[PDB]
Design a protein around this ligand. Structure first.
Ligand code: HEM
Ligand code: CAH
Length: 408
């Protein structure tokens, strides 16, 4: 049973579209495919759905890019739908606009900048190799449970100086953050609230212990960056460390599954990567263009007209980042991975002040994964008649990816 809200007076009927971000029409055929259905050749750049509490959806790449770049007009004070979940959401600095956002992003960048990330390459590689060598000779694996949900999680927990045995409870919190349970805005609000509380509970003692700490881990490094010449307050720290865990554990995991499904169905593309190692390295960004997973929102700051549509202060606009990288108006044949594509522009990492702090880590993880995978499992296919199971929400997910190959 679908929960509908009535449209507010300023939304005209001709812009209404019944789109459910948490269970997209056509989702069974794929998350990206399902979002692509929304983007028909004549659909308005902004449409409004009565589902998920009622909100706008930007349907074209340049709107998504522009909105992300314009925090003075589109605020991060709510970035989740439904509104109830967005209001309960308590992560730092994603809830902040500049200038409040700025010193916290600086602190994060101390830990996640490209030069710091580069130092991590061999640890990441070691982790990838160990996992791959566990099944490489077997000739088959369930990629989701045996790799994609394992590799990035071990990478991040090691980097964060946390026990790997916490992976399960943290993954469960992550699920209810990005894909909250419930068939009602209030239910989803409550699911998110409880998940966000679980993160704060887990994170509090770690913060207490590592303040002024000597540890070399990501959390200690970032925690002890001063904010305006003072220790980071408790309220902000809780939201900050929770966000690190959330990004580190429930992004790359999902990205990898979508990517691998595609690769397993395009052996020519895999062959190219194999034969030209530089095509692989330089081609990773094209993968990020093609396999966006995040759909989040911004809060309309003032009554305005935007791309010919009237918006009211407080309106939420969902930004399905897949609709930038896959916009046929930005990229010819957007659904094909072309490793040589010169223009790979996308909003997979969003834009503006909040542009993904973890993007260097994400790029390295994927680059290393592909290098060590192809070295040991050069050819592979999706099992005959296998059907991956897809989930849509603030972050997309996919499971059931049985791969098969002839051991080399
Ligand atoms: C496939 C990989 C990833 C994707 C697609 C992705 C996507 C995004 C997006 C779209 C945003 C902007 C959210 C918004 O403000 O509306 C973001 C921000 C952020 N991400 Fe990533 N992310 C990925 C990996 C990571 C990783 C591994 C981390 C490690 C901690 C991370 C940490 C962060 C942080 C801390 C922010 C907030 C930055 C700020 O508000 O200034 N991300 N990410
Ligand atoms: C939307 C995000 C992917 C982004 C901000 C969030 O809350 C995430 C779920 C983790 C971080 O990387």
């Amino acid at each position: 049973q679908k929960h509908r809200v009535a449209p507010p007076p300023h939304v005209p009927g001709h812009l209404i579209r019944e789109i459910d971000a948490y269970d997209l029409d056509g989702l069974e055929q794929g998350f990206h495919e399902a979002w692509k259905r929304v983007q028909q050749p004549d659909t308005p750049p902004l449409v409004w759905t009565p589902f998920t509490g009622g909100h706008w959806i930007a349907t074209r790449g340049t709107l998504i890019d522009e909105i992300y770049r314009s925090p003075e007009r589109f605020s991060s004070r709510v970035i989740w739908v439904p509104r109830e979940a967005g209001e309960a959401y308590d992560m730092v600095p994603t809830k902040l606009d500049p200038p409040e956002h700025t010193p916290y992003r600086k602190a994060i960048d101390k830990g996640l900048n490209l030069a710091e990330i580069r130092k991590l390459e061999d640890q990441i590689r070691t982790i990838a190799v160990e996992i791959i060598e566990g099944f490489a000779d077997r000739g088959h694996c369930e990629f989701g449970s045996e790799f994609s949900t394992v590799f990035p999680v071990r990478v991040f927990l090691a980097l964060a100086g946390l026990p790997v045995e916490d992976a399960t409870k943290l993954g469960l919190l992550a699920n209810e953050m990005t894909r909250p349970s419930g068939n009602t805005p209030e239910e989803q609000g409550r699911s998110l609230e409880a998940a966000n509380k679980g993160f704060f509970e887990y994170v509090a003692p770690i913060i207490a212990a590592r303040r002024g700490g000597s540890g070399t881990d990501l959390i200690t490094r970032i925690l002890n960056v001063e904010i305006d010449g003072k220790p980071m307050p408790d309220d902000r720290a809780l939201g900050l460390v929770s966000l690190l865990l959330l990004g580190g554990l429930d992004t790359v995991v999902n990205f990898l599954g979508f990517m691998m499904i595609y690769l397993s169905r395009h052996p020519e593309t895999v062959a190219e990567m194999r034969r030209e190692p530089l095509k692989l390295q330089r081609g990773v960004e094209e993968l990020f263009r093609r396999f966006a997973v995040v759909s989040d929102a911004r809060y309309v700051v003032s009554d305005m007209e935007f791309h010919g549509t009237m918006l009211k202060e407080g309106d939420l606009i969902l930004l399905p980042t897949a609709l930038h990288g896959l916009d046929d108006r930005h990229h010819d044949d957007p659904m094909t991975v072309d490793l040589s594509r010169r223009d790979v522009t996308h909003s997979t990492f969003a834009q503006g002040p909040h542009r993904c702090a973890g993007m260097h880590l994400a790029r390295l993880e994927v680059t290393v994964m592909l290098q060590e995978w192809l070295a040991r499992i050069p050819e592979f296919r999706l099992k005959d008649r296998a059907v991956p199971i897809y989930h849509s929400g603030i972050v997309a997910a996919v499971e059931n990816i049985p791969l098969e190959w002839e051991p080399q």
